Amino acid sequence: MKCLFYIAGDVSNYSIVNYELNGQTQNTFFAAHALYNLFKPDKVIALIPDSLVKDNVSDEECYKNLVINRAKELNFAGMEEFMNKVEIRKIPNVGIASAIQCENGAPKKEKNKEGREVLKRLPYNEKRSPIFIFNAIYAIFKDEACDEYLVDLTHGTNVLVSIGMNVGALFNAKFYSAPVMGMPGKDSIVNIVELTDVVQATNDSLMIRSSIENLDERYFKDYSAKLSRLNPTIFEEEEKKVLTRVKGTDVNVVINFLWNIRNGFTVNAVKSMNELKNIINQLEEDLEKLKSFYKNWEEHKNFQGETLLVLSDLDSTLKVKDLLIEGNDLEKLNYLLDLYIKASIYDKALSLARELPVAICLNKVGGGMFDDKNEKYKHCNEIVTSYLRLRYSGLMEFRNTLMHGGLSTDMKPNVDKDGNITPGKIVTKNKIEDFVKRELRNYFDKIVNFLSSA
Amino acid sequence: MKCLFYIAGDVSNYSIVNYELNGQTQNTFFAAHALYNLFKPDKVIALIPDSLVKDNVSDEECYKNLVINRAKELNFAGMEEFMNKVEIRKIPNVGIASAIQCENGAPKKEKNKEGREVLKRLPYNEKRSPIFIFNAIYAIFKDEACDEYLVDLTHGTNVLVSIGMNVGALFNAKFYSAPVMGMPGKDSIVNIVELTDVVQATNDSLMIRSSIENLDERYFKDYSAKLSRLNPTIFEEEEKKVLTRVKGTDVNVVINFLWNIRNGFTVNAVKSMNELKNIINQLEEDLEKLKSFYKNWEEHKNFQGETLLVLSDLDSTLKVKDLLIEGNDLEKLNYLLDLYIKASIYDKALSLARELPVAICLNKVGGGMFDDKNEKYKHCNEIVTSYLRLRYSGLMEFRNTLMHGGLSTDMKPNVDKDGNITPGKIVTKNKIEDFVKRELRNYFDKIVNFLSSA
RNA sequence: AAAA
Numbered sequence: 001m002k003c004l005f006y007i008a009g010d011v012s013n014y015s016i017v018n019y020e021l022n023g024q025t026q027n028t029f030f031a032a033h034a035l036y037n038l039f040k041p042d043k044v045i046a047l048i049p050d051s052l053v054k055d056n057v058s059d060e061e062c063y064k065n066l067v068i069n070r071a072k073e074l075n076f077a078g079m080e081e082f083m084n085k086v087e088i089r090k091i092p093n094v095g096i097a098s099a100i101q102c103e104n105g106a107p108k109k110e111k112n113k114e115g116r117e118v119l120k121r122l123p124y125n126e127k128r129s130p131i132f133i134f135n136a137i138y139a140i141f142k143d144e145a146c147d148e149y150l151v152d153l154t155h156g157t158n159v160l161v162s163i164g165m166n167v168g169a170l171f172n173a174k175f176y177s178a179p180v181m182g183m184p185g186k187d188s189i190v191n192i193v194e195l196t197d198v199v200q201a202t203n204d205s206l207m208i209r210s211s212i213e214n215l216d217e218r219y220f221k222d223y224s225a226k227l228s229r230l231n232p233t234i235f236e237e238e239e240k241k242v243l244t245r246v247k248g249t250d251v252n253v254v255i256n257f258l259w260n261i262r263n264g265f266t267v268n269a270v271k272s273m274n275e276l277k278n279i280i281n282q283l284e285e286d287l288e289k290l291k292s293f294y295k296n297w298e299e300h301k302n303f304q305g306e307t308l309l310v311l312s313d314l315d316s317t318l319k320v321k322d323l324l325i326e327g328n329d330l331e332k333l334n335y336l337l338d339l340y341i342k343a344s345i346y347d348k349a350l351s352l353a354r355e356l357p358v359a360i361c362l363n364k365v366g367g368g369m370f371d372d373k374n375e376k377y378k379h380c381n382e383i384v385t386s387y388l389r390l391r392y393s394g395l396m397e398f399r400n401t402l403m404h405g406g407l408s409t410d411m412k413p414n415v416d417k418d419g420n421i422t423p424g425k426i427v428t429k430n431k432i433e434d435f436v437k438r439e440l441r442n443y444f445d446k447i448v449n450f451l452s453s454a
Numbered sequence: 455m456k457c458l459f460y461i462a463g464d465v466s467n468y469s470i471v472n473y474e475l476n477g478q479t480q481n482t483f484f485a486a487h488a489l490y491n492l493f494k495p496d497k498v499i500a501l502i503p504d505s506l507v508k509d510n511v512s513d514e515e516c517y518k519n520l521v522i523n524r525a526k527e528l529n530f531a532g533m534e535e536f537m538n539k540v541e542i543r544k545i546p547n548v549g550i551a552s553a554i555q556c557e558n559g560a561p562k563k564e565k566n567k568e569g570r571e572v573l574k575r576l577p578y579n580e581k582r583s584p585i586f587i588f589n590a591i592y593a594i595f596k597d598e599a600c601d602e603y604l605v606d607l608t609h610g611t612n613v614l615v616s617i618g619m620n621v622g623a624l625f626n627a628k629f630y631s632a633p634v635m636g637m638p639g640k641d642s643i644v645n646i647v648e649l650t651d652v653v654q655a656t657n658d659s660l661m662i663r664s665s666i667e668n669l670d671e672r673y674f675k676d677y678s679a680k681l682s683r684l685n686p687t688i689f690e691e692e693e694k695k696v697l698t699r700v701k702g703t704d705v706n707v708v709i710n711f712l713w714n715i716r717n718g719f720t721v722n723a724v725k726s727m728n729e730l731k732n733i734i735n736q737l738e739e740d741l742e743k744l745k746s747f748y749k750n751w752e753e754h755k756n757f758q759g760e761t762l763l764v765l766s767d768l769d770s771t772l773k774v775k776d777l778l779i780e781g782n783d784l785e786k787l788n789y790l791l792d793l794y795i796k797a798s799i800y801d802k803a804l805s806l807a808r809e810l811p812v813a814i815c816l817n818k819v820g821g822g823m824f825d826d827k828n829e830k831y832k833h834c835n836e837i838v839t840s841y842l843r844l845r846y847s848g849l850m851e852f853r854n855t856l857m858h859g860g861l862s863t864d865m866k867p868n869v870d871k872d873g874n875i876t877p878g879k880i881v882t883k884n885k886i887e888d889f890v891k892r893e894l895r896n897y898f899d900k901i902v903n904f905l906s907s908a
Numbered sequence: 909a910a911a912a
Binding site for chain 1 (some may be wrong): 574608611616636642648651655
């Protein structure tokens with residue numbers, strides 16, 4: 001269930017041209033046909049604006065004719081039968097306009113000095129919110145129920161093109177555009193660029209930034225596959241020396257680092273900090289050279305066809321420099337606490353703030369394993385447990401409650417004979433939220449300042 | 455540090471108009487100058503695609519001398535100054551165009567048939583990947599170091615406009631477009647449009663979808679503020695009846711639901727399930743009328759300039775219907791297990807899988823509190839603990855491994871002097887991923903099935 | 909609305 005979405009434009013200027021995507025040249029005056037036969041979708045839909053044509057009965061019927069009224073020039077038959085197929089639906093538009101009125105079922109023609117040619121009407125000055133048009137297009141898209149979404153662009157106002165792109169973006173649409181200026185001419189060869197990646201590359205960079213910001217490892221889009229298929233043909237010494245470094249950027253380490261944080265592996269997450277500090281330092285001076293090459297693109301037409309390269313994918317990976325600090329593994333964990341607080345991952349933040357003072361004390365008592373067999377641990381954990389339990393009574397409750405979550409001796413639900421579990425305690429969203437985000441840091445520093453003189 | 459950016463086009467055709475931005479007016483011909491005089495940015499970076507210059511001297515300065523040669527045609531004197539210090543950064547382009555040759559600095563003009571014009575030898579044809587142009591624009595944006603990013607898409611090819619939008623999207627730019635489309639004429643009036651709304655509305659819907667997909671409330675963009683401020687001055691009662699329902703959609707419940715799932719409060723998360731069943735069922739209808747309203751936008755011209763209502767923000771909230779199941783609170787939790795497995799939130803999945811069979815057995819006993827005082831719990835927890843520790847030795851280990859976390863008696867790290875920590879057990883990143891995602895479900899059913907026998 |  002493939003379906004082609006076609007943004008409309010002024011047909012009274014369209015010159016004949018031949019298109020080229022994966023070879024298979026087809027020629028006409030508009031993309032809609034060239035792309036129809038190329039992809040062979042189940043149903044093509046025409047997205048026409050209000051500021052384009054206007055008549056007493058079917059403005060919708062005027063477009064179906066106006067496109068054949070232009071297909072008639074050069075006796076172009078492969079259009080009359082293609083118009084029985086495409087469904088024409090009207091969309092709103094913004095701005096001053098030169099429209100084209102219809103007397104009835106055919107476009108009207110005004111013989112004013114030049115000769116019998118189409119007429120103009122400018123009183124359309126519609127003040128609309130872009131979100132309104134977006135909503136109107138979103139509805140027409142949603143009310144189609146397609147498996148695959150393919151949207152021909154190239155035509156339409158720069159505003160509606162921008163709007164339609166964002167609507168399509170939601171329906172995981174494949175975007176195509178035939179870039180051609182004025183006076184293209186007969187038998188001209190025009191590529192039909194696929195912008196899908198450019199879109200699902202901008203999204204990736206926002207997901208990569210969110211992945212860092214909220215310490216997640218499922219928001220990060222692993223571009224190691226794109227980087228794996230690199231090393232393109234015509235390569236100059238200086239570009240290949242930089243690119244071969246970039247090609248081998250250990251991105252899977254940054255993923256593992258975020259994983260060991262989301263799943264709470266500070267021991268390994270904090271240890272990796274120094275390695276990543278070297279990864280990003282190299283990724284900075286690599287991207288700086290790439291930024292230079294792309295800032296002088298006129299000399300790097302080998303990167304000409306690079307669909308497997310994205311500066312935004314790399315620059316967004318640079319954000320991890322924030323999640324990195326310097327110092328001993330203990331000092332690095334102290335920072336990791338604050339990262340668990342800024343990202344609202346409470347469960348890990350409390351657990352870390354609970355066990356860090358054990359480790360702090362172990363360091364000042366000569367150090368010792370986190371095993372119950374170790375006496376320097378055993379006693380040292382009792383110092384932090386007992387100090388916490390008589391002072392920060394809340395730190396202990398909040399930690400344990402979040403650790404076992406639902407169905408625990410901490411929450412005491414009744415379960416019921418019927419099976420309708422009924423909770424025992426409440427502890428609202430903004431109970432935990434206030435504690436972690438406002439006191440958990442202040443309280444921690446007060447604990448460590450106590451264990452300092454230990 | 456505000457700075458404007460604009461996809462530059464064919465200035466040779468550009469006609470004078472009177473631009474309108476929420477009160478302030480401006481009388482300029484080309485788009486950029488109107489916004490420059492308005493927002494008064496610190497910088498104005500530009501330069502066209504390579505598809506309109508090929509002069510022997512500076513390809514850049516040529517645009518500087520032709521833009522002003524169009525300013526001289528009309529009655530003007532103040533577009534050579536304050537516009538002289540504009541940053542001209544050249545960009546690549548795709549397809550077939552007609553690129554104005556240009557002499558040493560100013561353009562090269564010739565006459566064929568007509569009295570005088572600028573000779574169109576203009577043979578532009580370049581095969582480029584859209585990602586290349588995106589990279590080239592990205593580098594220009596990054597190498598500007600602006601505080602605020604402002605971007606024009608009033609002009610340019612539909613391809614470069616799409617590209618520039620995605621590049622701007624990352625610098626969280628404010629997007630503006632002056633929709634004209636044709637023959638504005640002398641003293642033309644054009645009320646500009648801000649598309650910034652549409653962009654950070656498409657992003658919001660993708661964030662809302664992943665918020666659901668990965669059970670994380672942090673990704674959800676709370677539109678209750680937009681809905682709070684939804685007070686159109688004049689709207690029809692039918693329109694009124696639907697929107698006044700939508701206005702009061704309590705979205706904060708869906709947020710709280712996701713917060714409980716993310717923090718492990720399955721008790722309260724599972725109970726809210728049918729309240730939410732009712733919430734989405736209500737938004738499944740009106741959404742239906744909103745999508746019928748917007749599919750026949752010509753009727754409800756009242757939301758003509760309503761930049762507050764959004765359909766994608768609501769439709770993406772309907773995704774939560776997946777997270778919802780019907781049945782007793784026990785079998786709702788059984789589903790919640792699979793939701794903790796599908797989203798790779800392991801820690802909660804195992805804790806739920808370990809503690810669910812305690813509740814299952816309690817129901818078989820007629821129900822009991824999950825308090826250590828309760829004998830029906832005490833013994834019944836020992837049945838599940840002993841059965842687990844005797845067969846699913848792995849379930850118990852992994853569960854404490856995700857519960858206590860790195861710094862723990864479960865990981866046994868060393869920590870010596872100078873704050874250095876060395877792990878005791880290597881993290882089994884894939885041993886967790888494979889166990890939870892392949893065995894935990896099968897294992898759970900084998901325990902519950904055994905419990906069902908007694 | 910094939911660089912308004």
